[PDB]
Design a protein around this ligand. Sequence first.
Ligand code: MG
Ligand code: MG
Ligand code: MG
Ligand code: MG
Ligand code: MG
Ligand code: MG
Ligand code: MG
Ligand code: MG
Ligand code: MG
Lengths: 345, 190, 199, 138
Amino acid sequence: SHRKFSAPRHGSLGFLPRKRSSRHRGKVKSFPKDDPSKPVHLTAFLGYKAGMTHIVREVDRPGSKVNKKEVVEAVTIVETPPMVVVGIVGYVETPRGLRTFKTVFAEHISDECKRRFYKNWHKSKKKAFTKYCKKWQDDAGKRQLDKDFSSMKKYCQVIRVLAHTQMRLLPLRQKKAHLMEIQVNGGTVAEKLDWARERLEQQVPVSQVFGQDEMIDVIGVTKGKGYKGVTSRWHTKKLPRKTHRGLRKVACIGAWHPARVAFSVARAGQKGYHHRTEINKKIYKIGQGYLIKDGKLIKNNASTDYDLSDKSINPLGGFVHYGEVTNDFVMLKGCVVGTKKRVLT
Amino acid sequence: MKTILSNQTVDIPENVDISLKGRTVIVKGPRGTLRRDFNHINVELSLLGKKKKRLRVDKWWGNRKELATVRTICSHVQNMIKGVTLGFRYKMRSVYAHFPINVVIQENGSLVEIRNFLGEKYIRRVRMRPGVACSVSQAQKDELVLEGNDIELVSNSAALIQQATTVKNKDIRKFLDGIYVSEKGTVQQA
Amino acid sequence: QVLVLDGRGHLLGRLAAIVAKQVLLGRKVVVVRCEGINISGNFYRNKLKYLAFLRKRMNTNPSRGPYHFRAPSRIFWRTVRGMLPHKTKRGQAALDRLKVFDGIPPPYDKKKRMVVPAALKVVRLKPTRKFAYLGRLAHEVGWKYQAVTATLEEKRKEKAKIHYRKKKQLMRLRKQAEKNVEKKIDRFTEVLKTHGFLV
Amino acid sequence: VFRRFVEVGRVAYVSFGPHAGKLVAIVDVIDQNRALVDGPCTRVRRQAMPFKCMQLTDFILKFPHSARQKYVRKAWEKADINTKWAATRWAKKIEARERKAKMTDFDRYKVMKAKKMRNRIIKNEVKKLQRAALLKAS
RNA sequence: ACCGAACGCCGGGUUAAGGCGCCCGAUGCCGACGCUCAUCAGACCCCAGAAAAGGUGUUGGUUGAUAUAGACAGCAGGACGGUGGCCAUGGAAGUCGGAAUCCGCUAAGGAGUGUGUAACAACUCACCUGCCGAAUCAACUAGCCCUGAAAAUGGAUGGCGCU
RNA sequence: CGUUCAUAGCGACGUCGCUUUUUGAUCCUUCGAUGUCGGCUCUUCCUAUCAUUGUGAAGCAGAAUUCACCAAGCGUUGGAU
RNA sequence: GCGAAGCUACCAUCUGUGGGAUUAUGACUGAACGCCUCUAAGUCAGAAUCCCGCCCAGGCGGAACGAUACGGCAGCGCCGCGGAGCCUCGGUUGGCCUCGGAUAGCCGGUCCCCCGCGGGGUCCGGUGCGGAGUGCCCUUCGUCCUGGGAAACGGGGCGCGGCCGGAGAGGCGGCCGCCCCCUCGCCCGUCACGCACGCCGUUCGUGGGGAACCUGGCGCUAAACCAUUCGUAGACGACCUGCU
Ligand SMILES: [Mg+2]
Ligand SMILES: [Mg+2]
Ligand SMILES: [Mg+2]
Ligand SMILES: [Mg+2]
Ligand SMILES: [Mg+2]
Ligand SMILES: [Mg+2]
Ligand SMILES: [Mg+2]
Ligand SMILES: [Mg+2]
Ligand SMILES: [Mg+2]
C-alpha cells in the first residue's frame, strides 16, 4: 500500500557513493570557458584554511531592512601564499575527450615541489628530473624544447600551467608543496602558451588571479567524520524509546518485492571527507602579507579605514590548530568546506 | 492510385531572370536574389524557353499526397518572383482599449521594443527574421510596416510581433489588445 | 584482409546484420563514420525510442543496469551485439573483431572504405520517408563529442581534397603518357583489347 | 531531368530474365509496371515483359502504338538498329566484358605478360612528364 | 494437454508442422501484385489482449446526383407582397411552442434556416446573373492507419532490429 | 436541464467499455506452519492532476471559476476523539 | 558553580547555477480542394517535461611527464648484426583515402571572368546500365647460362647523411647529396639445374608473439612496501604528513 503521510526524502542521491574521497586536495572538476577576447590569466589558485572571524560592515542593498546598517558577518581566512609555475601542459580535443598532449617542465624545481614526487624523501636519493633538466642547458635539447612548445602552439586546444604551493612559508608541518594544474584562459593558443613560458619558475600571487568583491568557488574535501550511523549520516528520524533492536536506524529498509535493497535507501557508512564543490563565496578582502621596509608592516592586514589600528588577522594567541598567517590571504564570506590546515582550491 | 504525369507552368516575366541548379530555383531581378532548395520534393524542374520564359514542374507516377507538392512548389516560385519584383509589405495596426502600444524600432528594422502593452512594465524586444526590416508608419497612426522580399521571413516576423502581444489569464473576447496583421501587400504595385 | 565500411548512409540495423554475420565468419570488420548512419523512420519517433531505452534501468541499483551508451559508435556496436550470441565465447570472440568509430580516425582515414548497398538508405527506404541521422539522435540523447568529431572531420576532408586533386593530376599524366607513347605500346595494348579490357 | 523515356517503339536492352543481353523495342505499355514488347530481329517473341528487367537505350524507332510484328520488324531493319547498337560504347563494353570472361588460362598469361610491359612503358613516361613539369615549375 | 509426428543402436536420402535480415540451419530469388506511416505502427492456431462510436488520413467499391439550356466552389445582388396569415395575449407580425402551410408578383424569395427581440426592427440563410470557365457533388459502404486507449521494480512482435 | 440554447457545464431512456485501491465468485499454490490488524519509520513506483509550470474552455468583464490538455518535476502539513 | 579544546543545533552562520530537443498549444508559408486550411512537402514560438551542463563517483578504459636498482655478488635500456631452443598460434599477394548526389551524377579544357601553382564561376567538348568501371586496379609465380632484337639509366647494397609533411589513437611515408655494385621488364634464339621413378599437411605474412640462453658498441646508476612518526584520517586496513 501507499505511504499514509508524505514527506520529502532524506538526503540527496546526487552526491553518492558517500565514500571517503579518493583525493585529499580538491580537484577543479571543470574550469570556465575560455574566450579569445580577454587577456590570459589563471582561473584558480590554492589555499590553506587557517580559520574564521567576524567582520563588520555597512551594507548597501537598497530595499532591505539592513540598508546602510552595519552588520556582522562571518568570514574564513585562507592562507594563500604565492604559487610557482613549474610546468605547462597541453590538452588536445578529441572525440574521445580531451587527451593530455605535451608537458614541459622548468629547469629548476624546488624541493618543496620535488618532495611530492616521492613517498619518502628521507629514504630517496632525490634523483627526479635530474636527467630532464639537462635539456635546458645544451643546443640539441633547447631546440627540442622549442619544437615541443611549437607543437603545442599548432595542435593543443587547452593549455593549463602547472603550479605548486610554497609550502615553506606556511606554519603547517608538511614540506610537500601541493602541485596543481591551473588553466590559462585568455587569447590565442600561441599567446597563451607564450605567457606560460614567461611565467616558468616564477611566482604567481593571489591578487593576480582573484580580485576583491568577486564571487569564487571553493572546492575542497569535507571535514571527515569516520564511520557513522544512518542517523547522523542521512538525518533520518530516530526511532522511539521502546525499540527492541536499536533506535538510531531506519525501520524498514525496502518493501518486499524488488527484493534487493536499493541504493536509494539510507544505510550507514562514511560520514564526511567527501569531495565537495561549493560556489559563490564572495571575497570581502585580500590581505597583503607581512613584509618590511625598515620595521615590519603587520598593521596593513586586519586594519581598516575605520579601525586604523595595527592588527594582523592573526587573532590573539594564533589561529587555533594552525599558526600565524604571515602571508597574504583571502577572506571569503562564510564557511568553506573542510578543516583547518586543509589545502583549499 | 498512381498518376502517370501531373505538371505545371510558371510564367517568369521578362523583368526577372531565373536559373536552377538541379532542384534549387534561384530567382534574381530588381530587388535581389531569392534562392530556394526543393531537395525534399522529388520533382523535375524543367526551366524552358528561349528568353527563359517559364518554369515547369513535372511529377511522374504521383500518388495523391505526392502530386499535391507540384502546385505548392510552383506557388513558392511565384512568391519568390513577386518579392524579387515587387516585395512584401505586411501592415499591422496596433489595437488597444486603454494602454496605447508604444512601438520603437532600434537597429534598423531588426529590433522592435513594445512598451506599455496592457500597462505592463515588461518591454517586448522582438528581433526580426534576417532579410526583413520593420518600420513605423507615417500617415496612418497605430501601424507598422514589414517590408521584405522573402514572404516567409516577412510573415514570420510579423507573426512574431503579433504573438508577443498576447494577454495571459484574461478573456480575449474582451481584451482585444495588441498588434495584429491588417494587410498583406507589396512594396510597389505595377 | 580487413573490411572497412563507411557507416555513412546506411540503415542502422541493416548494416549491423551484415556486419554481425561477417564478424562471426571471422572477417575483421571496421565500421567507420557511424554518426553518418541513419535509422529509418522519423526523428522524433526514434528519439522517443532511445528515450525508452534510457528509462530502462535496474531499480535497486541502476549502476548494474543496461548500459545505455550515448556515442553513435557504441550505439551501432550495441545493435550488432544484439545480433550476436554474445554470452558465449564464440560471440564475444566475434565481437572483438568488430571495430567501430565516432567519425573516421587515422588508421582508416587513408583506406578505400567500402559500402554495403543492401544497408543503404537510398536503396532500402522509399524516398518519401523520414529517417533520423544517428548523429543527431546521439546528440540529443547525451553524446558530447559531436562538434569535436565534426571539426576534426572538416580537417579530414580538406586534407583528402588535396590527396584527390593530386590523384587526378597523376591520372591526367597517365592519359597523356599513353597518348605520347601509344605507337610503341601498340602491340601490347591491342592484345589487352582482344582479351576484353580497354573498351 | 529525364532523357530515356518509356515510349512506344523505344528500344530496350534486357538486363536480365530469360532474354538477357537482347534488344527489344517496346510496342506498347500495358500497365503501370508492365510493357508489351517485341524483338523481331533480335530473336525475341511478341510478349509482355516488365520494366524491372529492361533498361532502355537512347534509340527510338518509329511505328504505331499497336503494330503487327512485320511493321516493327521493318522499322528495325530500316534504322539498322542492330548495327548502331553494336557500335555503341555500351554494347562494346558488353563485348569487352564477354571477352575477358572467355579468356583461356593461356591467354590470361599472355595478357598478364603484355600488361606487365605495357604498364612499364607508361610508368616511365609518366615519370618523365613529372620530371619535366618540375623543371617548368623551377 | 496445441500442430506435426509417436522412440532398439547407427550411415545416406526425404519429409511434416513450422521456418529462411542477424541471433539461427534455410531466399545472398534482380521473386510477382497491391495496400499502409502510426509524437502508442504492425508483425501468425491454442495465446496470453480490447469495444461501441468517430476521422476529407488514405485506398477501393455501391447508389444516386450535376452540368455548356452554362455549372461547381470563391466573391458580388436581392431575399418581397396578400400579411399582426391562423392558434396562442405572457408576448411570436417567419423566428418560446404547436395545427397549418396556400396564392400574387414572380427572376425569385420558405406563411420561413438561424442570430436577435418583451414585441418589432436590424442582421442572416433560395433563383438569377459578372468574373469566371469543365467537369463537379452527395449519401452509403468496406480495407489498412489514426482517435476512442489509465497502474503501479525497468521490459519485452522471444531478442536485436525492420519502413 | 441550463431565462434562450440538446452537447459552456450537465445528461434521462438506452448502450459499449476499462480497472483490480471495494466486495463477491473460485479453490490452482501453500496445513513436517510464507508470523494473523493498525500505527510508527524508510524507499520507490503509478496517475485516474489537489497544488505549482506551460496551455486551450466557459453561462471567462475583473476577482473568484469550473471543463479539458501536456505533465507525476516538486510538494501534499500540526492536532482532539 | 563556572569551563578551554573538540564535537554540535534552523537553537548559530554560509552556499544552492546554465543550455539544447521539443510536448501541449498558438502560429507562418502552403497545396490537396480555382477559395480555405498549423500540414500534406517545408518554417516558427514553446514548458516545473525530456536530455545534457554544473555537482558526486570514477571502467579488466585510456594520458602526458618523472625517476628507473654501482656493488659488497649486481641487473638492466638502446643499437646493430649473429647461433641454437622450448612454447603460443592465426594466416598462405597487395590496393597509399575525394566529397558526396540519387526527379542525378563523372571528367576535361578554358577562349573569358573572380579568388588564394591551386580554389570558385560561366561557357563549350566528352562519358553516364557507370572502362578515369572494386564487374575494378596494382603485383607476378620456377633458377641460371650465352647472344640477338624491342624496351633502357633504372634497380640495389635491411647502402649511407640532410630537408620535409603527419597529433583523432601521428606512427608512417615523402623529397634532396655521396660511396660501391649490377643490365633486371617484353620477345626470341641456347642449354643445363636429383628427371627422387602417378599420390597428403606444398607455396607466404616471418628475422612472426612469448619464455629461457651465447657475442660486440654506447649508456645507466631505484624507488616502493614494512618499521618509525604525524592527526587534516581512522573499526581494522586505508588516508594525510615528518626523519644528516
Ligand atoms: Mg500520497
Ligand atoms: Mg521490547
Ligand atoms: Mg429547455
Ligand atoms: Mg518469510
Ligand atoms: Mg493523463
Ligand atoms: Mg478570471
Ligand atoms: Mg528552447
Ligand atoms: Mg502543430
Ligand atoms: Mg523550433
